[PDB]
Amino acid sequence: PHRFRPGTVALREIRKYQKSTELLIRKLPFQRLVREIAQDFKTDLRFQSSAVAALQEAAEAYLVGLFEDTNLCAIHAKRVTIMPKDIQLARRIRGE
Amino acid sequence: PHRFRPGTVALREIRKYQKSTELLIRKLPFQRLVREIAQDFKTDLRFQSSAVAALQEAAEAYLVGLFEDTNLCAIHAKRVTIMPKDIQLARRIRGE
Amino acid sequence: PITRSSRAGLQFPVGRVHRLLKTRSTAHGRVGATAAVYTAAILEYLTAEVLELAGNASKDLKVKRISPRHLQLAIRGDEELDTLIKGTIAGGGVIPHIHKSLI
Amino acid sequence: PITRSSRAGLQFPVGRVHRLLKTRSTAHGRVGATAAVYTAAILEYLTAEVLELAGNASKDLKVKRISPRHLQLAIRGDEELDTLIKGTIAGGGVIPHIHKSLI
Amino acid sequence: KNVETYKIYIFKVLKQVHPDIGISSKAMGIMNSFINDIFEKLAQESSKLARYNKKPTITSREIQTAVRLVLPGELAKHAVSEGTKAVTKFTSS
Amino acid sequence: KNVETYKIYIFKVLKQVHPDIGISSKAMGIMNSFINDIFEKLAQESSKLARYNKKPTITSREIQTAVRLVLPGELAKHAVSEGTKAVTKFTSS
Amino acid sequence: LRDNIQGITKPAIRRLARRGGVKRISGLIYEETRGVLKIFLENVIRDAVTYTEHARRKTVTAMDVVYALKRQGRTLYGFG
Amino acid sequence: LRDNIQGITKPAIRRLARRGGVKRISGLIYEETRGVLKIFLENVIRDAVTYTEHARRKTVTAMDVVYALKRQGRTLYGFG
DNA sequence: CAGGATGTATATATCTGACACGTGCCTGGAGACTAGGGAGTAATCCCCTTGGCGGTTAAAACGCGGGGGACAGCGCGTACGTGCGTTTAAGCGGTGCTAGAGCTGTCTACGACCAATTGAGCGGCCTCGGCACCGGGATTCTCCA
């Protein structure tokens, strides 16, 4: 069997997803989530498709930046595995 | 001798300086530093005293906030002593 | 002649806010008096809230006068005002807090 | 009729920038034509810089067309433009960077 | 020249809220600066809203939307309620 | 309706800088948004400068100072030089 | 439209982390990321819905989303 | 003027860290803090001098400093 | 526990400058009237939203082996806290003065406003080449040896 060492495939995905520019979250679940969230502010809202697309790009960019900061925090604590404490520290420093 | 354990006077100083509102940096050295820095942008500049005072308050508030973030980072790495890497991480996450 | 502030039940000046809005309007824009009443009322409400919190903080410290320290305590003690007021208060100091693991 | 853009040697429209400034000026303010020329020159220079970096990035990738990926690479590859342009480029991706300790 | 401020109105509000508590000059200046900042933010948001909708007139609707955008949560809700009450009283008088 | 954008001028600048290089529509939209953002920042800074000194007129000096405030470092230096060059060329004609 | 927050699957969060350079991901990271994303979307959607309601519209336009992102210092290029 | 950055003495930096809740301080923290403070002052003073030069003045006023601080999202209250 | 020293907390008289108040005046708010431009409302249409159905593969979900990373424990030596003698420069007070901020007066360069004109710019249509997709060959990287 071509059993790879734990981490090699992770590095391959890291290299592959950094060179691509496609959206990573599935479109329909994100659209459903956006509609559910907007249901709390105003009922029976209609969403333009470009609005959902822009929301998806914004959310993905925000999450990528947050994960970059989280990885920095994880490296700071002499770890390679990110943890919820890392995300909490990153968001606290950013002022969120 | 009343030799205190290290860190007790540190805690007392933390308690004492947090309840006060006085400026911590000496006024004259800060004024000299501000004049030296401004010498690079325009020669023979005069400084209103209130301008130097406002600069001092802004600088002290900024440094206190930076040290709060640095302490957060140091506690994250399971340490009580802040290090330059903590300041660097804080300034990186803040976007500085 | 009665003032617009008295007409709307506000301590803040409706006329001055209207004039400031007209001065700050871009490209010969128009401003209604109702907008001035709304803005004056909201400024008065924010003043009342911040002053109430500051007076509570001052009373907690057994001091009869509001100081920048009390303003800092009141602003950082309320989540909404902390979110709204991100500026630096000169002479306000910091809220005394020490981490659990630091003791 | 020689256009102001041709008079100032700029590709960008001086007249349109002047009109935009006039309809953006607050409180019936005045705008001089020199301000419009200066602003048009600034916009043209920024366009030229960004397009030069993007074209270099596209040439490095052996393509004849600039895409949002090349714009992202050009913007984040220059410190000054990175500082100036903090917005999110849709479809730009991220600059490939793997931290040293992960290998 | 005379410099216009909000000190008198802040003092009236303070006497309404805390009749027996005074305010220092530095605290009064800080309050005036805070009110100026809030007014500037509201005016900027109202101008942006007017520009977006191609509506040259700024009315109570624009101020309400600016308050909802700028002020956070329950503070925005209570501010909107106070503004609505003030506008209703002004129109009824 | 007619939507006014900088697409033609951006294309002209590109053909001046890279004659043989083309550009996609999405990149054009992104660049147009970027130019609009920069123009908005410059206009806001110029308005603040005019308000601060009680000058109702926004002349080239206000734009120059707003650029020194907004663009960073060597980019600001080159932009100021280019703007001064264009202003001199416009005046000399 | 209920509890569609689980629609952001673990592979999707893993891909997002991989694009950001993350090598290993803990178990609770998915829940933490879902909460953070929900908060961010709540803020942006609230601002966009306020913009839409002011314009007396019932359709949330992409341009309102661009404005909402611009207000919070997260300018987006390409949709406006 | 030269080497005036050393006028921000180590006791002053220690007091600033104490106000920030710091219990233990490293040796290189003083030089790091001096560099960071120099950068911050460079930015603020550059903006303030730009504002002063626009007003055709040679004297930097508190208004210029306040505007420079406001531009960088560091609004200061207590000086106008 | 338990005593010794202690810095901080508590109480009180001093005063002292900082806050609340009184007065001139002048500038901005209020009242009234006019013109007109912008907001409110209604009708229309068209395309842009939502909803639904078939298929079906590519992705998500679930099991399972397992090895590598997180974390606890221990030693250790090195850097930082603490206290003291001392001196070095900051702070207070005063003085001496001149650069420069601030207000006022002119007036001429310059920008707002309107009308006519025309050419630049924008919307719609067509095409062909650069880029994307599918498949294969060669190149590079990795685990196990």
Place this chain on the structure above:
DNA sequence: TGGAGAATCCCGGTGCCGAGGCCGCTCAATTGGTCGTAGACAGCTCTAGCACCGCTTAAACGCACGTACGCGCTGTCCCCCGCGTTTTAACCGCCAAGGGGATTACTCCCTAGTCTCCAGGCACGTGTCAGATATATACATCCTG
């Protein structure tokens, strides 16, 4: 290194649809002229920013001691990673329905502009009292035992 094997780069061929160009038309830039205005400059005043000197003393500094903490090393285990098999719902494609957003027209009403009047809000001046200061003093805490 070596080999076996997977991943990826490259190389090609074909398609396909998006960019660049062309044309009608439109509406805003341009030019000319007038008229007000504001900012560039000169001038005077008077305020404070700079410089200096003298003295005091509190803080910075250098040093010596000690000990707590950062860090390296080792072991344990548990928990994500990699891979295989099942399932499931996302996406493409197509079709229906309707609703609401954008446009146009009418109306009317609400605000800018101008003039007059007056009162309230802002510089200037004054009294007195709440808190900072100095001194005395109680008390809960740290440390060493």
